[PDB]
Design a protein around this nucleic acid. Sequence first.
RNA 1: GCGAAUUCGGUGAUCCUAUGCUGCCGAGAAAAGCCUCUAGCGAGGACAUACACGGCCCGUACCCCAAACCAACACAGGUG
RNA 2: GAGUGAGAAUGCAGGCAUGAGUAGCGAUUAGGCAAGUGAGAACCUUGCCCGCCGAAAGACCAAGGGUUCCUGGGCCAGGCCAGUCCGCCCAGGGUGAGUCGGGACCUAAGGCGAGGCCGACAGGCGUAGUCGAUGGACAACGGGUUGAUAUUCCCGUACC
RNA 3: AGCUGUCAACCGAGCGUUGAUCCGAGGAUGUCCGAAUGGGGAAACCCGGCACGAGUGAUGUCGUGUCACCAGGCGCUGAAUAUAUAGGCGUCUGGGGGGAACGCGGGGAAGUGAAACAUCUCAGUACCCGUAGGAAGAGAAAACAAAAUGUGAUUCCGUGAGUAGUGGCGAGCGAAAGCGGAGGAUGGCUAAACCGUAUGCAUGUGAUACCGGGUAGGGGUUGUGUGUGCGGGGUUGUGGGACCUAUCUUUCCGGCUCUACCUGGCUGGAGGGCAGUGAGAAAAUGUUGUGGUUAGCGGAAAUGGCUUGGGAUGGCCUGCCGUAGACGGUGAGAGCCCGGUACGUGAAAACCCGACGUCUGUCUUGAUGGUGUUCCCGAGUAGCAGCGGGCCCGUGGAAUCUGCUGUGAAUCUGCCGGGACCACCCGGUAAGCCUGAAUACUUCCCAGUGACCGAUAGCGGAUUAGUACCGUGAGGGAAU
Lengths: 63, 97, 64
Amino acid sequence: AAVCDICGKGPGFGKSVSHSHRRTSRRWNPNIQPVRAVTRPGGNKQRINACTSCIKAGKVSRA
Amino acid sequence: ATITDPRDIILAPVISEKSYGLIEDNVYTFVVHPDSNKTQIKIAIEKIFDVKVDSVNTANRQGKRKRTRTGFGKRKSTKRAIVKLAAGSKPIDLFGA
Amino acid sequence: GTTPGELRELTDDELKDKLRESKEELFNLRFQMATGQLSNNRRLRTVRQEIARVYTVLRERELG
RNA sequence: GCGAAUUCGGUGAUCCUAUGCUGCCGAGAAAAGCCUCUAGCGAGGACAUACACGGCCCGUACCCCAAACCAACACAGGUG
RNA sequence: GAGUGAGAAUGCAGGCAUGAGUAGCGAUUAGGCAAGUGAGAACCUUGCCCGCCGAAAGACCAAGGGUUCCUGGGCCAGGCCAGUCCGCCCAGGGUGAGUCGGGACCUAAGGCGAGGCCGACAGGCGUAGUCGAUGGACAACGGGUUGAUAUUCCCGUACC
RNA sequence: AGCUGUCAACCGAGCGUUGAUCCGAGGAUGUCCGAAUGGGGAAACCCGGCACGAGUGAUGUCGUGUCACCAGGCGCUGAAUAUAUAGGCGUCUGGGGGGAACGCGGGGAAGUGAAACAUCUCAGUACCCGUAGGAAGAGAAAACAAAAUGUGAUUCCGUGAGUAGUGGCGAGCGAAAGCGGAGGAUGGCUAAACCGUAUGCAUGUGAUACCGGGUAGGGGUUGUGUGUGCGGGGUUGUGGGACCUAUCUUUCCGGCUCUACCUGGCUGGAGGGCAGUGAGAAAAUGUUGUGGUUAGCGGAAAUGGCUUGGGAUGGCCUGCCGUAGACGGUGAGAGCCCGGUACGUGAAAACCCGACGUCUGUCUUGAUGGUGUUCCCGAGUAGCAGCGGGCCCGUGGAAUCUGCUGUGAAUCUGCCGGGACCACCCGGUAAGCCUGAAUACUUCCCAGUGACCGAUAGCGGAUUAGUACCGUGAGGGAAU
Ligand SMILES: [Mg+2]
Ligand SMILES: [Mg+2]
Ligand SMILES: [Mg+2]
Ligand SMILES: [Mg+2]
Ligand SMILES: [Mg+2]
Ligand SMILES: [Mg+2]
Ligand SMILES: [Mg+2]
Ligand SMILES: [Mg+2]
Ligand SMILES: [Mg+2]
Ligand SMILES: [Mg+2]
Ligand SMILES: [Mg+2]
Ligand SMILES: [Mg+2]
Ligand SMILES: [Mg+2]
Ligand SMILES: [Mg+2]
Ligand SMILES: [Mg+2]
Ligand SMILES: [Mg+2]
Ligand SMILES: [Mg+2]
Ligand SMILES: [Mg+2]
Ligand SMILES: [Mg+2]
Ligand SMILES: [Mg+2]
Ligand SMILES: [Mg+2]
Ligand SMILES: [Mg+2]
Ligand SMILES: [Mg+2]
Ligand SMILES: [Mg+2]
Ligand SMILES: [Mg+2]
Ligand SMILES: [Mg+2]
Ligand SMILES: [Mg+2]
Ligand SMILES: [Mg+2]
Ligand SMILES: [Mg+2]
Ligand SMILES: [Mg+2]
Ligand SMILES: [Mg+2]
Ligand SMILES: [Mg+2]
Ligand SMILES: [Mg+2]
Ligand SMILES: [Mg+2]
Ligand SMILES: [Mg+2]
Ligand SMILES: [Mg+2]
Ligand SMILES: [Mg+2]
Ligand SMILES: [Mg+2]
Ligand SMILES: [Mg+2]
Ligand SMILES: [Mg+2]
Ligand SMILES: [Mg+2]
Ligand SMILES: [Mg+2]
Ligand SMILES: [Mg+2]
Ligand SMILES: [Mg+2]
Ligand SMILES: [Mg+2]
Ligand SMILES: [Mg+2]
Ligand SMILES: [Mg+2]
Ligand SMILES: [Mg+2]
Ligand SMILES: [Mg+2]
Ligand SMILES: [Mg+2]
Ligand SMILES: [Mg+2]
Ligand SMILES: [Mg+2]
Ligand SMILES: [Mg+2]
Ligand SMILES: [Mg+2]
Ligand SMILES: [Mg+2]
Ligand SMILES: [Mg+2]
Ligand SMILES: [Mg+2]
Ligand SMILES: [Mg+2]
Ligand SMILES: [Mg+2]
Ligand SMILES: [Mg+2]
Ligand SMILES: [Mg+2]
Ligand SMILES: [Mg+2]
Ligand SMILES: [Mg+2]
Ligand SMILES: [Mg+2]
Ligand SMILES: [Mg+2]
Ligand SMILES: [Mg+2]
Ligand SMILES: [Mg+2]
Ligand SMILES: [Mg+2]
Ligand SMILES: [Mg+2]
Ligand SMILES: [Mg+2]
Ligand SMILES: [Mg+2]
Ligand SMILES: [Mg+2]
Ligand SMILES: [Mg+2]
Ligand SMILES: [Mg+2]
Ligand SMILES: [Zn+2]
């Protein structure tokens, strides 16, 4: 839940608000998953931490 | 540069009533730099005074702590060495009694 | 102790010779004043002068 | 400086044999050293003894159930 | 132009009073006398009795302190008093190890930690290892010494 | 011509006309701890390996170097296994800690005010964290404005204004546009719409398909798609650029568009430019100011007289010089006594900024104006949905920016800005990159200033000062 290795995405911090509109500091942790994706066309694939946005971008290929 | 010589170690001899109680018994007292060793001091005394020594005993005397209005005064730490020449018994005339 | 005019025009074997004799004189003089038979300081200072400059000239002509 | 005798017996431990023996359950550390076995070498090591030799650095005084440590004291306290 | 006017805020810092030459002088043991030094002696030194502890109030060690140890000098400051005395102060001297205690040997609880994992970041973990005794392997006595040090110095005999 | 720093004297030993000491520039020596880096460790202390030498009859022993970690390149090797990778080695270049403030970028509260208090404010304050610099960040419009044929990068002040506004519309918070100022450089290019080469990956109707007139010699730029890498040529507001067809064209040679022959399209080499330590290519090759600095030298003019007087620098009187009548001391208020002041001078050596001669780099295969017509100019981005931040803007009708999570566009009759929203007209081209000048700060150094204090004041510290002392702590903290 820290940083996906390629686009350099780090968690930002913000405040939760109530119906009474009360502030309280909270956290947003980015969607990153441990997946093993192909790097060279021979079909080898290594476990790296990639965020879901990057996976959707397809910056790492699927095979 | 600098070469290795044995008599870069001896600071001085010490004169005292105990030192004379030893001088009568063919055992001598010398003041020696702290970073020395009995082997080095043995080789030094042998080479310098052409006497074949048996063994050397060394002791460390912690410095005193003398009063002064300026503040807390401490003297330097000194190392005394006890040396005992062999049965050959060659007095060191350089000691000057 | 000796002038640089002589020192720079003199050679390797001779600064080796004055090197050993100056170490020998440092030995002797420091430890007669250690024994307490010696009085003044300038002797150790000038033999220090000699050893320092001979070591400097040694590395100087070694590099050059 | 000189310098006599220097044995018997008995009592006797919480000390030694004992890291032992007997019994209990609540069932009682580690590694180094030591002995030995081979893998990987190898043309000179193995056991005793007469002899001269060489074995480092540091602590080493004093106080220590106290006027010297901890309690602001030369303190009716505490300290293994 | 003002840090410009104090008598108080259980004000602040310094100094000095009364209570006052009043209470106390730190135990369950207790002294007295003689001679000696000294200008001064219950308090120090030497001699004889008495008193007390004696599983300590004796003798050693570890932790701790660091010269309080010994000798010589002096007693305005310190010792709850005077003090020649002192653990006062000034000077000098004093601590001797192949074999006693640690390092060159090894580990427990636990600490550090290459890479590695996790963590916006600072960081937190723990592998190989390396540290970490309160533990284990591995080598002594009698006597003598001066004014103070003795299983260290010397004599005598050995060890690993 | 004196000198061996001070408390702090005192002795004794001595150095100097050959110039000692003193002040400056450069150089070396530089124990140990401390990033500490051969390993370890309770800081200034314990323990080793490797190479070259000294010494003993040998050892023991003694000196000199070298031995931390991480990152980034080079060469070798390649495990599970065959290709190949991790890991493993050897060598260079970098970084590690400290510093008062200033700055960027993330984290980030409460005491308080609202006379309570939750929105709010306190406040993006304190503090923590990782960065480099001497300044940093920002910086060339996807900016304003509103019909004027306007401003024209960024930065920092004074206005505009406590105004338009926000706010349990309370406490409170708070613009922008425009104007006046400081400073100047409206500034050069990369990368996709053709190609040559290092290439491979694939195949081959392996012969009439490839070269820019004529004759002739020779024998896969895949046929078609997908994806990446390498390059000449398109980076735009009146809205702009090439797969092909129309007009002048300020040198030449070669090789190409799978070949040899006019037309059309690219690349290598000789000569005017553009510039260069730049932010738009990067590494190198060598040069003078009385600019300054770290330090010094010269530098006028009464022993004047008389008196109180211990001493005059005092009182009076002559005559003092002055491009110097600032300041201290000497026995009392001294420009005429000295330290010195105006003013001149002066550096062997070293350092920072400013010119002047080998050498280096580029293109003049290129350049300037002229008539119609057939994939590229920054992508998981702009934008959208939800959830939050920061601009006055606290979900209010809410533009603009950013972020987390899902979706998701065109390439010019494309877009977004013009403060919920659009038809016709109006102004600029987003996802890429950097860039000096004005500014803030002062641990340090120099020269000065003060209607600032004169020992309970002024820094805690004019003196053993962050010392004694207290607290095992972060620390607190004196008097003299
Ligand atoms: Mg991460
Ligand atoms: Mg934030
Ligand atoms: Mg809050
Ligand atoms: Mg999808
Ligand atoms: Mg010894
Ligand atoms: Mg004292
Ligand atoms: Mg029994
Ligand atoms: Mg031996
Ligand atoms: Mg030692
Ligand atoms: Mg002892
Ligand atoms: Mg003691
Ligand atoms: Mg005792
Ligand atoms: Mg106490
Ligand atoms: Mg007491
Ligand atoms: Mg007590
Ligand atoms: Mg007890
Ligand atoms: Mg006032
Ligand atoms: Mg008053
Ligand atoms: Mg008062
Ligand atoms: Mg009261
Ligand atoms: Mg009173
Ligand atoms: Mg009474
Ligand atoms: Mg009473
Ligand atoms: Mg008492
Ligand atoms: Mg008496
Ligand atoms: Mg009793
Ligand atoms: Mg008892
Ligand atoms: Mg008893
Ligand atoms: Mg202890
Ligand atoms: Mg101790
Ligand atoms: Mg005593
Ligand atoms: Mg005395
Ligand atoms: Mg007295
Ligand atoms: Mg007193
Ligand atoms: Mg004393
Ligand atoms: Mg660990
Ligand atoms: Mg690590
Ligand atoms: Mg571990
Ligand atoms: Mg360890
Ligand atoms: Mg241990
Ligand atoms: Mg003892
Ligand atoms: Mg003993
Ligand atoms: Mg110099
Ligand atoms: Mg050197
Ligand atoms: Mg280190
Ligand atoms: Mg280390
Ligand atoms: Mg590399
Ligand atoms: Mg392979
Ligand atoms: Mg740094
Ligand atoms: Mg609050
Ligand atoms: Mg409030
Ligand atoms: Mg209120
Ligand atoms: Mg710079
Ligand atoms: Mg800029
Ligand atoms: Mg305004
Ligand atoms: Mg208000
Ligand atoms: Mg605000
Ligand atoms: Mg091109
Ligand atoms: Mg081009
Ligand atoms: Mg137009
Ligand atoms: Mg002058
Ligand atoms: Mg007069
Ligand atoms: Mg006058
Ligand atoms: Mg004046
Ligand atoms: Mg006057
Ligand atoms: Mg004056
Ligand atoms: Mg004067
Ligand atoms: Mg809003
Ligand atoms: Mg809005
Ligand atoms: Mg554009
Ligand atoms: Mg930009
Ligand atoms: Mg600027
Ligand atoms: Mg006063
Ligand atoms: Mg403390
Ligand atoms: Zn990602």
